[PDB]
Design a protein around this ligand. Structure first.
Ligand SMILES: CCCCCCCCO[C@@H]1O[C@H](CO)[C@@H](O)[C@H](O)[C@H]1O
Ligand SMILES: CCCCCCCCO[C@@H]1O[C@H](CO)[C@@H](O)[C@H](O)[C@H]1O
Ligand SMILES: CCCCCCCCO[C@@H]1O[C@H](CO)[C@@H](O)[C@H](O)[C@H]1O
Ligand SMILES: N[C@@H](Cc1c[nH]c2ccccc12)C(=O)O
Ligand code: NA
Ligand code: NA
Length: 509
């Protein structure tokens, strides 16, 4: 079985897993929508009580499962908890990460397409001072790229370039995955992470220099870092903060587990886990917060920036920032570095999203890596057509798998690992082999605070958001729901085949 060759590579691979589009796209928007500094207090708390605890828990299960030759939750759940129900719960460990990859890789392909176009100077030229006039040409460029409907019908007609760049993106993903863990993911992580950090720092540095009548980058940083206590009371802010934590640390997607399963049995996961998590937060707040938010603040002021963050998830990243850059000298080249940074950030994450499916096929159905990677690519590529051609299909997948699903899965794995599996056995399993021990306080957080914290959050979440689901929405959302439900059923079938194949092999001994 594959193991990480070096500790640096392991750390960088886990860091590349955690550090992605969420760092540079989702965080700034999430922070801005929720009062900037108001977002931070709950955010830090979420990181201490949930992000860190769940991070270690997943590392343990991965390493534990890996030792017995299993890297995914359907089997791992069964090992910690000997019930048929545990396997079915385990399907989410394959389903959630697979659904996420489907739309995530597509967004990743945009960054590649924009990066390529920005390099070659195939970008819109705004008139050289109105806000609408400079943003409109860029909104056009993005809308034309992904084929946003010019009509009532909810159908996307993306360009040939976009579709072709998507193929290339898939190819690049497959080419890294097909080499494997040590020679594939690990090799790329060492070259990709340093490149990513250098690009980000340069952009951060360049963004600070941004100066305008409207404001400065420093104005943007103070808004982000200044804390407001009144906002903390609202449930909404805590919901957003916790949602970002799961998404950024890749928790509850079963992806950390698959990666962890490749760590050797007695190899440290305590310090390694913390370092990778520490790297993502530094990338997310120090780098992510600094580029997107402060750039918009300088040019537009705080109020407008918040308005920009509210407008859309991709508005700031694909429309506003590129438009702000266009004014600046060498702006187009600066746009290329931004999108190129995004592409590497996403590339490192997407390979992690597809690995669990790949691991399952290898681990449970005994498929070769070539076949496992190619079939997985096929399912993701084919499925991605719904996200490419059906309007709002992306959002639906993101809400179910990227939002609701992960919080449920995080709590479920925490309960199985601690309550059902036994808190003490789980404690030894986590701390064992660690360069440093987990603080004694965290034992109680994991066993009591974290599960109680998440349970309440889900309940509050349910009360307000549940009425909305199916109460009122466009009928086209059912197409997505129907398809992803079908995926879960299809994945359940493979688990069924895996359990039965194993039975035939057992009788054969
Ligand atoms: C590669 C598998 C067969 C092709 C899948 C059918 C859908 C792809 O079709 C493509 O869609 C793009 C976006 O609308 C268009 O720009 C292209 O002209 C079109 O060929
Ligand atoms: C990294 C390599 C990317 C190559 C981009 C190839 C896709 C561009 O394809 C172009 O699409 C246009 C719009 O349909 C057509 O008008 C052009 O004839 C066609 O060459
Ligand atoms: C949910 C998956 C949807 C896949 C169907 C997409 C097939 C594309 O559909 C085709 O697109 C062409 C543009 O490239 C148009 O010229 C054709 O009229 C149209 O039939
Ligand atoms: N954490 C990634 C996105 C992500 C969510 N779930 C994942 C699972 C595996 C890899 C990456 C992810 C980011 O910050 O952008
Ligand atoms: Na992240
Ligand atoms: Na990444």
């Amino acid at each position: 079985r594959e193991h990480w060759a070096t500790r640096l590579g392991l750390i960088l691979a886990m860091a590349g897993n955690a550090v992605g589009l969420g760092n540079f796209l989702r965080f700034p928007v999430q922070a801005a929508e929720n009062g900037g500094g108001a977002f931070m207090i709950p955010y830090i708390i979420a990181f201490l009580l949930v992000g860190i605890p769940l991070m270690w828990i997943e590392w343990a299960m991965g390493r534990y499962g890996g030792a017995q030759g299993h890297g995914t939750t359907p089997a791992i759940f069964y090992l910690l908890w000997r019930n048929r129900f545990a396997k079915i719960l385990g399907v989410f460990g394959l389903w959630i990460p697979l659904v996420v990859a489907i739309y995530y890789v597509y967004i990743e392909s945009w960054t590649l397409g924009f990066a390529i176009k920005f390099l070659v100077g195939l970008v819109p030229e705004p008139p050289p001072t109105d806000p609408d006039s400079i943003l409109r040409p860029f909104k056009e460029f993005l809308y034309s790229y992904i084929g946003v409907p010019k009509g009532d019908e909810p159908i996307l007609k993306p360009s040939l370039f976009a579709y072709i760049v998507f193929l290339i993106t898939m190819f690049i993903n497959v080419s890294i995955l097909i080499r494997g863990i040590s020679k594939g993911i690990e090799r790329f992580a060492k070259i990709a992470m340093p490149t990513l950090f250098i690009l980000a720092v340069f952009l951060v540095i360049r963004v600070f220099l941004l100066e305008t009548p409207n404001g400065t980058a420093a104005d943007g940083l103070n808004f982000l870092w200044t804390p407001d206590f009144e906002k903390l009371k609202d449930p909404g802010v805590w919901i957003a903060a916790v949602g970002q934590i799961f998404f950024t640390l890749s928790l509850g997607f079963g992806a950390i587990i698959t990666y962890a399963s490749y760590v050797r049995k007695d190899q440290d996961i305590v310090l390694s886990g913390l370092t990778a998590a520490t790297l993502n937060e530094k990338a997310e707040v120090i780098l992510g917060g600094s580029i997107s938010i402060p750039a918009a603040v300088a040019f537009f002021g705080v109020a407008n920036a918040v308005a920009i963050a509210k407008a859309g998830a991709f508005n700031l990243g694909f429309i506003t920032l590129p438009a702000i850059f266009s004014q600046t000298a060498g702006g187009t080249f600066l746009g290329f570095l931004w999108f190129f940074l995004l592409f590497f950030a996403g590339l490192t994450s997407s390979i992690a999203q597809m690995q669990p499916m790949i691991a399952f096929l290898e681990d449970e159905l005994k498929l070769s890596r070539k076949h496992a990677v190619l079939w997985t690519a096929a399912i993701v590529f084919f499925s991605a057509h719904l996200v490419m051609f059906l309007n709002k299909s992306l959002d639906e997948m993101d809400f179910w798998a990227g939002t609701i699903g992960v919080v449920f899965f995080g709590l479920t794995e925490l309960i199985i690992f601690f309550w059902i599996f036994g808190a003490d056995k789980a404690w030894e399993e986590i701390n064992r082999g660690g360069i440093i021990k987990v603080p004694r306080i965290y034992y109680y957080v994991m066993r009591y605070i974290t599960p109680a914290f998440l349970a309440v959050l889900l309940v509050v979440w349910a009360r307000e958001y549940i009425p909305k689901i199916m109460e009122e929405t466009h009928w086209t959302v059912w197409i997505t729901r129907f398809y992803i439900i079908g995926l879960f059923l299809f994945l359940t079938f493979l688990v069924f085949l895996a359990e039965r194949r194993r039975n035939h092999e057992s009788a054969g001994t």
